[PDB]
């Protein structure tokens, strides 16, 4: 009934915000639509897998907020297996490699690949994390899809196919669907290309022991009966002294402040009185989430390691159902598994098949790529299609189509009276990740503390000391990588 | 509580559906979110204007369903004023003309203009009205914004600038926001470029006497108490034998079938049990409506007519708040008025101003365009920003960004168990218009009649006799229009001769 703050949504962001408010002595209620907490994180436990993350899972250096929160909740990390060689599968053949960037040998292709990565980061350096719409060339870059940019930039088919995979894999959408400005902001606000694509010393370095769902579950454990499961919010009324929040199951909650910790577009599921201001009213219709199926195939042993492969596979082309894989084996070396992502249009296409049909296709692919018949002998299979979720709308995060970020980007975390906005989409560092969810939850919480007089304005945004357990090493480039010409650069000279 | 069919939404589509169902003997209920029917049509009445349409207004030849419905409800139409000259305002100057297309004199620019319009229609003929995703190059065209298409197609800036205005004005969105396949489909399913842009012989030929809001009101009068105002639907449950529909004011309705007659994205406001299938679940997060303010400036007399201007202005430029106007003077010749549209990014930009600051900017623009100080002396002003409507989401209609129509398009009117989809967005002819609303509403109602075994399958889609009051002159082209070369095609003639 009556409380200080209603939080809408029990994902990591909402739970992080509720915890902060609780710890400062306010009465918080969390209204969660599902029969569980965690949102776009979900850890399934059964005897065959023990535990498996079917949503968000990876953390790495520079993600210091999710690591601090998780450590305080008593969680620990382990390292994703990258001891042996990575595989780039191109034109029906596997090429083993080391280091984060799939290498290339033809000298024109080399210049073209080097330039592509380098240009993503150069363009990034002119985009403010906290305001990408303030980039000098914001309108120019926002009025282009990533398909347009790649067509201009990539002089070789080899670079264009890897660039396309890069976009597909990072934001679960086609190059033609997404704004160039948004995608470049997105890479930049994760620390750039090397950081975003790296296992060792990057975003996929680590997983949580027991699964990432433990973050939300363990905060629910703290808050007790303050978390209301199967309470989808349908109605928020701000006309009176206190804010009134109504759920689908007819309950009414009364508060001084509200935090909306849901994906922007899922805002549409709530009827507002008074109506939302114009810009938010339209913004929440313009911000879809991507399309992905996360798939985990279990095997008797991690057989790929015997052939000096780590289990990472980068798989070019339209034919392959999965473009990217990591070893999902447990740190103890058991529950051997390969994790794969089915991305974008392939998620839509392959979801018509049965579970068994998807398993068969994945096993045949992995057999080809790893060059092993052992891949044809799976002991178990788990998957989750995030497209079918009424209360996610997809995964991993919200993408911005051409034109939207510059016109509506400002409104994303703009308070509407006593509603403040959280969720990973509103973060400025690792937005789209669990790290961003924490940053945005805590920030929105401190906005309400400031509105109440408890803290000064300069404490709303707070820095995070570096994790002692997951220290970040610097991103380095070489002289040649910095100064080698592009293909059109090499043409000018001749 | 109990009925045969709940219709969600009391716009033209919903009310047309309800009417057909009621006339066939079923018990129907219409649940409407607002305190009025009409949706994206809305006629304001006060003593200063008598009546004015702040939403959908114009009807024309080939729109035979809305004309037939309006006639059956006892409504009349009148012709929009196009007696005198149109104005094309470009780079700070006004160029009067006649006929639908702004003309050009420079021969190179002429070939480019002619080729732009012709290619729009050429690509359109490749695209099935009922299945745009079946066009041979559907994928190539849908992976492309209209901005990319115009950059490839227009060899002059003159043509590119006019083509940009054509997109902005027809779909209230920027060229970079919209799919090429979708836009080309949209134009084609209205009967092509000439039909869509024309006043005489086109979309903007006529208006209803007393306003277009009478269509929805008069159907409400036929239905009596079966229309429920201030019932926003929040929840649809299809787990049991009968469908349960719940409203925000805690009322429950029980029906055999539901027609959803709301814009696709406003489907997001409804919680579904069981959950929507994957494809529709994602589709309704991907289909926004455009941005527009409709503004009407009233004057003592229609002074433009005396300068031999009909009141139509096609206004190009970033500084212009309004890109298109029509004479909105009553047919009796009184309540002289200029109707204008503030489009796309300009609706957003200029919504920051007060009502009086917008009035001033409009008058100054009209003064310049018409060469008339009288334009600075308005007697009244009315406007409506459709962007702020919770239960519309924008106007005129839904646009599709790149990649969406080929991937999600086929689920737009695909039933979900016992929910059928109306709304103008689901039409195959004048989708986006009041015409499309009627087609979609009556088609969805008949899908239900078929499901109940009351009509055979071949009667779901029903053709419409031509209006005898508003006959359609066919779209014709001249020999030169058909065979004059593109700009690159002239350059190919030059390289082939001199070799
Ligand atoms: C799904 C997913 C997946 C599958 C995956 C992933 C993910 C996801 N991610 C993301 C995450 O998860 C996120 O971000 C988070 O979680 C979010 O949070 P928040 O914000 O909180 O939100 P959510 O969760 O959603 O929540 C919300 C809530 O609310 C609710 N609701 C609704 N509505 C409502 C409600 N309530 C009440 N009422 C109402 N009305 C709901 O229900 C919920 O609960 C992630 N993340 C991280 O961090 N990590 C990870 O891992 C993840 N994942 C992913 C990733 C992927 N990747 C990375 C990158 C890589 C790449 C690499 C490379 C490239 C290139 C080359 F060449 C190489 C390499 C891979 C991929
Ligand atoms: C808004 C608007 C405006 C401003 C204008 C316009 C329009 C609009 N349009 C459109 C119409 O209006 C539409 O389409 C219709 O109306 C639709 O219907 P429907 O489908 O039925 O839908 P609605 O209305 O929306 O309804 C719905 C309902 O529902 C409800 N809800 C929601 N949600 C809910 C509910 N309920 C319960 N629950 C829940 N949850 C609501 O409330 C409602 O009621 C139009 N149309 C027509 O036909 N006409 C017209 O006029 C119109 N408008 C416009 C036009 C424009 N334009 C045309 C074209 C031109 C061009 C020219 C040129 C170009 C170029 C050159 F060169 C030259 C020239 C322009 C203009
Ligand atoms: C050749 N491609 C790479 C197709 C375009 C060059 C881009 S650009 O012409 O340098 O803009
Ligand atoms: C010589 C270069 C002229 C480019 C002219 N534009 C119109 C910009 C592009 C023509 C595109 S296309 O070449 O017909 O595909």
Curated annotation (Swiss-Prot), chain A:
Inhibited by deprenyl. Changing residue 363 to S: Complete loss of activity. Its main location: mitochondrion. Its cofactor is FAD. The modification S-8alpha-FAD cysteine is found at residue 395. Changing residue 156 to A: Dramatic loss of activity. It catalyses: a secondary aliphatic amine + O2 + H2O = a primary amine + an aldehyde + H2O2; (R)-adrenaline + O2 + H2O = (R)-3,4-dihydroxymandelaldehyde + methylamine + H2O2; a primary methyl amine + O2 + H2O = an aldehyde + H2O2 + NH4(+); benzylamine + O2 + H2O = benzaldehyde + H2O2 + NH4(+). InterPro entries: Amino_oxidase, FAD/NAD-bd_sf, Flavin_amine_oxidase, Flavin_MAO. It holds the Pfam family Amino_oxidase. Belongs to the flavin monoamine oxidase family. This is Amine oxidase [flavin-containing] B. It comes from Homo sapiens.
């Amino acid at each position: 009934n009556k409380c200080d703050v209603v939080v809408v949504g029990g994902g990591i962001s909402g739970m992080a915000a509720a915890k902060l408010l609780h710890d400062s002595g306010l009465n918080v209620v969390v209204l969660e639509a599902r029969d569980r907490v965690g949102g776009r994180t979900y850890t399934l436990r059964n005897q065959k897998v023990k535990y498996v993350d079917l949503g968000g899972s990876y953390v790495g250096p520079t993600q210091n907020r999710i690591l601090r929160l998780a450590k305080e909740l008593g969680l620990e990390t382990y390292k994703v297996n990258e001891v042996e060689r990575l595989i780039h599968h191109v034109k029906g053949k596997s090429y083993p490699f080391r280091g984060p960037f799939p290498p290339v040998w033809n000298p024109i292709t080399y210049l073209d690949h080097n330039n592509f990565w380098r240009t993503m980061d150069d363009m990034g350096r002119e985009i403010p994390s906290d305001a990408p719409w303030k980039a000098p060339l914001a309108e120019e870059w926002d009025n282009m899809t990533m398909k347009e940019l790649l067509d201009k930039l990539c002089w070789t088919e080899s670079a264009k196919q890897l660039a396309t995979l890069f976009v597909n894999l990072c934001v679960t959408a086609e190059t033609h669907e997404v704004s160039a400005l948004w995608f470049l902001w997105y890479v930049k606000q994760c620390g750039g290309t090397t950081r975003i694509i790296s296992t060792t010393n990057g975003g996929q370095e680590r997983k949580f022991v027991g699964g990432s769902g433990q973050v939300s579950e363990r905060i629910m454990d703290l808050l007790g009966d303050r978390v209301k499961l199967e309470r989808p919010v349908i109605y928020i009324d701000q006309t009176r002294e206190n804010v009134l929040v109504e759920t689908l199951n007819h309950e009414m909650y009364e508060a001084k402040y509200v935090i909306s910790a849901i994906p922007p577009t899922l805002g549409m599921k709530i009827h507002f009185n008074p109506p939302l201001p114009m810009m938010r009213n339209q913004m929440i219709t313009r911000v879809p989430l991507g399309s992905v199926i996360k798939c985990i195939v279990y095997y008797k042993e991690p057989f790929w390691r015997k052939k000096d492969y780590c289990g990472t596979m980068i798989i070019d082309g339209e034919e392959a159902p999965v473009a990217y894989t990591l070893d999902d084996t447990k740190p103890e070396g058991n529950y051997a598994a390969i994790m794969g992502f089915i991305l974008a249009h392939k998620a839509r296409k392959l979801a018509r098949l049965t579970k068994e049909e998807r398993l068969k296709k994945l096993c045949e692919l992995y057999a080809k790529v790893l060059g092993s018949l052992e891949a044809l002998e799976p002991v178990h299979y788990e998957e989750k299609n995030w497209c079918e979720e009424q209360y996610s709308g997809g995964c991993y995060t919200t993408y911005f189509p051409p034109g939207i970020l510059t016109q509506y980007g400002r409104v994303l975390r703009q308070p509407v009276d006593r509603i403040y906005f959280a969720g990973t989409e509103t973060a400025t560092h690792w937005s789209g990740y669990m790290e961003g969810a924490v940053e945005a939850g805590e920030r929105a919480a401190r906005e309400i503390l400031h509105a109440m007089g408890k803290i000064p304005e300069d404490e709303i945004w707070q820095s995070e000391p570096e994790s002692v357990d997951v220290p970040a090493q610097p991103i380095t480039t070489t002289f040649l990588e910095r100064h080698l010409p592009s293909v059109p650069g090499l043409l000018r000279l001749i």
